[PDB]
Structures are given as structure tokens and as C-alpha cells.
Amino acid sequence: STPADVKEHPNSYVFMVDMPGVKSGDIKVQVEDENVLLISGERKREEKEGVKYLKMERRIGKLMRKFVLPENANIEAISAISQDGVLTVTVN
Amino acid sequence: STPADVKEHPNSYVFMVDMPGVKSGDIKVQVEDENVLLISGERKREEKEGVKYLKMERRIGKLMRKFVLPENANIEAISAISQDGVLTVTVN
């Protein structure tokens, strides 16, 4: 799981998800069953080449959130922006 | 506060801080007293133009972490990268 904001513009819904350290290509934006918007991203490690960790507090692995819009609300136009670790998806 | 990793390369220390949604220009990287590395960033809101929030779980405001290297360890060469909401500072 990961923090999300959701806004309602006149003709669109906007989902804002935190994803520090997720490379695009590890981001999934997906519609399940035409109603559910599925947002997903995995943070990975930069692989002891004489490099030792002194402190490790950033957990890695997958961030994921599902969002259901009303039934009979068809997703036909989807938008995705990755910027500064925040993913903004705009769905009709 | 915000998650940080710290690695030790042969000739350098590396600090990796999560900062989703912080624009460079709102990032501060600073040496206090030649020994202490001070990393700072503030997340802000994109300002009802017919736009209404339905869900708001991303907290905003300042992220900040201090890191003290040993005394008599002089910071003369500092490095800062912002990428995908992660700030990597490399300090001699």
C-alpha cells in the first residue's frame, strides 16, 4: 500500500499516488473489468563492491492500490504521469 | 521525517532519502558546522476551480533529516541527485 489522493474535475477523475524510487517500466496502470483502476509499482535495490550499508530504512517491494469507479462507468481515456516519485493518473 | 538509506563507498558516503512530490528548488542540502549534513524538502498542494477532492491521504509539509559524520571529517565535495522522488547525496 501507498498514499493516494483522488480529485474530481468536471469531466475526469485524478489519482495521485506516492511512488518514490519506482522506475517507469516498473509502473503498472491497468483496468480490471472496465470499472476498477489498478495502480502498481515496485521499488528495487541498487545492487558489496566494496560498498557497505550503514543505515537502511527505505523498505522496497511493490506498492499497489485499487480504485473502483461506479459501475457502468467505462474507462476509455486514461492518462499517466510520473514525476518526482508521484504518479498522476487521469481517468475519464 | 522521511526514510533514509546510508551507504559507505571507498572514498565517499551516500545518503538516499525518499521525497515524493518535492520539486527541486524546494530541496535543501546543507552543511552545518562542517560535520553535519542537513537534507530538507517540502511537498506542496496543487491549488476549487470546479475541482473537488474525494480522497486525501498524502500529507504535505517538510521532510527533513540530519546526518552527522565524524568530527574532523570535512565536507568539501558534495553531490546531489533528484530522481523519481529519491534524493541521493554523496559526500566526501
Swiss-Prot record, chains A, B:
Keyword list, A-Z: Cytoplasm, Stress response
GO cellular component, one term: cytoplasm
Predominant location category: cytoplasm
Subcellular location: Cytoplasm
Record-annotated sHSP domain positions: 2-92
Family: Belongs to the small heat shock protein (HSP20) family.
Name of protein: 17.1 kDa class II heat shock protein
Native species: Pisum sativum
Phylogenetic classification of the source organism: Eukaryota, Viridiplantae, Streptophyta, Embryophyta, Tracheophyta
